[PDB]
């Protein structure tokens, strides 16, 4: 019931819609990492691609420019509805006022004032469009406590020729003169399970029916893990929002119902004739 | 004071000049500084005295026109540099030739500045108590000025 009530944002006193202008930043999405598959382009090259699915992505909270950071405003977006049974009452109270079921993860997006969106607004995968480069950030796979060889790529010591219980150990920590160990020295410790970002991944195709984004290459994290996806901050793709749904894509408007699958021009669609390099 | 007017025909017109205050307190002084008993009693702060020897765009006037002796010409020249660097001559700024605007970089307040700020390098190894590197303040040319302090002025800071 709560999810259906939020399906039509345009008919629920939407905040004023503003035009795009240079220097604008839109909101991003939170997606679930489905897996990988091969993808081919009209030139015959094969690209490994990761599948990102947007599940119950909604805007939750808005903070004005002054109350968060003088430079820019912030929006909190949550995805992946979860159970209500093992949650703190504070989190449940927050969602009850917002009229939504709880989400697994909250993340904050820096959005310019003109691009601000009312809380409770559903966000869909068609927000992004093929041909657009994007940035993905997620927690990396957790590998536990590890030694210097695996954590930092240390060479180690020879296996034979008399080495006495020294094969995978660190060598000398530092020099003797300073009589201490420098801060930041690389040592054995817990590896993985850190937030990392991958920059400049192209979007090859979007599936509107299931809200799947096809992103070039690898994305941090394991399968079924939530990721944060937002337009690329790389200088080359400085102003790409010019040709994208500026606040976001609203299915409620439905000016033209989108095809089930959206493709990038270079992508060789399945069901096309076999590629002959004529 | 003569000004050139162009029309090509160009001609110079001489105009009447403001006159010096008559009856100097100390007649028989060669330099105009000593005919008023100012030998060791002016500093960069005295814009009223300094301004009289300055061209409208901030340059120093030639010695043969001012009539100052070399000792006082150099003191006036150095005091003027320090006065300019202290922003005490807002109306004698350099002329902007064409299509040039002021740097717009914010101005740091400074006074008693011996050298041009552009060409002075930072002191990265300041030194310990007895090898301390000193930051020069004031000008050596004004070392003979009248001092009202118990000890001589601290030039090196």
């Amino acid at each position: 019931t709560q999810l259906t009530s939020k399906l039509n944002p345009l008919k629920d006193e939407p905040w004023p819609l503003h035009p795009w202008e240079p220097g604008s930043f839109r909101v991003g999405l939170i997606a679930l990492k489905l897996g990988m598959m091969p993808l081919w382009t009209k030139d015959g090259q094969k690209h490994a691609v990761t599948l990102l699915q947007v599940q119950d992505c909604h805007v939750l909270k808005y903070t004005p420019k002054e109350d968060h950071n003088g430079k820019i405003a912030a929006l909190t977006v949550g995805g992946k509805t979860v159970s209500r049974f093992y949650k703190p009452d504070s989190r449940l109270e927050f969602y009850r006022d917002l009229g939504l079921p709880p989400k697994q993860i909250h993340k904050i997006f820096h959005v310019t004032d003109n691009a601000v969106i009312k809380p409770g607004t559903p966000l869909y995968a068609a927000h992004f469009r093929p041909g657009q480069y994007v940035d993905v950030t997620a927690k990396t796979i957790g590998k536990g406590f590890q030694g210097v060889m695996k954590r930092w790529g240390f060479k180690g010591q020879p296996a034979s020729h008399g080495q006495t219980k020294t094969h995978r150990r660190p060598g000398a920590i530092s020099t003797g003169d300073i009589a201490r160990v420098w801060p930041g020295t690389k040592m054995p410790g817990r590896m993985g399970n850190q937030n990392r970002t991958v920059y400049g991944l192209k979007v090859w195709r979007v599936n509107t029916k299931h809200n799947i984004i096809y992103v070039n290459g690898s994305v941090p994290g394991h399968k079924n893990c939530l990721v944060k996806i937002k337009d690329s901050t790389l200088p080359a793709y400085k102003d790409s929002c010019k040709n994208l749904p500026f606040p976001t894509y609203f299915p409620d408007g439905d000016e033209e119902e989108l095809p089930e699958d959206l493709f990038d021009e270079s992508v060789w669609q399945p069901s096309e004739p076999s590629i002959t390099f004529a | 004071l003569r000004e050139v007017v162009k029309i090509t025909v160009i001609e110079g017109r001489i105009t009447e000049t403001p006159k010096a205050t008559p009856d100097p307190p100390n007649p028989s002084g060669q330099c105009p500084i000593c005919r008023w008993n100012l030998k060791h009693k002016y500093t960069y702060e005295d814009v009223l005295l300094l301004s009289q020897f300055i061209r409208p765009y901030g340059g120093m006037l030639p010695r043969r026109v001012t009539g100052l002796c070399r000792e006082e010409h150099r003191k006036i020249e150095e005091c003027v540099k320090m006065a300019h660097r202290a922003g005490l001559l807002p109306n004698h700024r350099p002329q902007l030739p064409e299509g040039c605007l002021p740097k717009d970089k914010p101005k740091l307040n400074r006074y008693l500045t011996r050298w041009a700020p552009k060409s002075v390098k930072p002191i990265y190894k300041k030194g310990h108590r007895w090898n301390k590197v000193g930051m020069a303040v004031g000008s050596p040319l004004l070392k003979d000025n009248v001092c009202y302090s118990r000890r001589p002025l601290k030039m090196m800071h």
Binding site: - | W115, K118, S119, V120, K121
Partner: protein, 37 residues
Amino acid sequence: FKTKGVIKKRCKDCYKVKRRGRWFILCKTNPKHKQRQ
């Protein structure tokens, strides 16, 4: 530009200037004569 401990004029056209905190002799006729302290 040769940087020398003591700077000396080398020809008639050589002239002396104080740029960026140092003394320079610059010669228009012969660039070889350019020196810095």
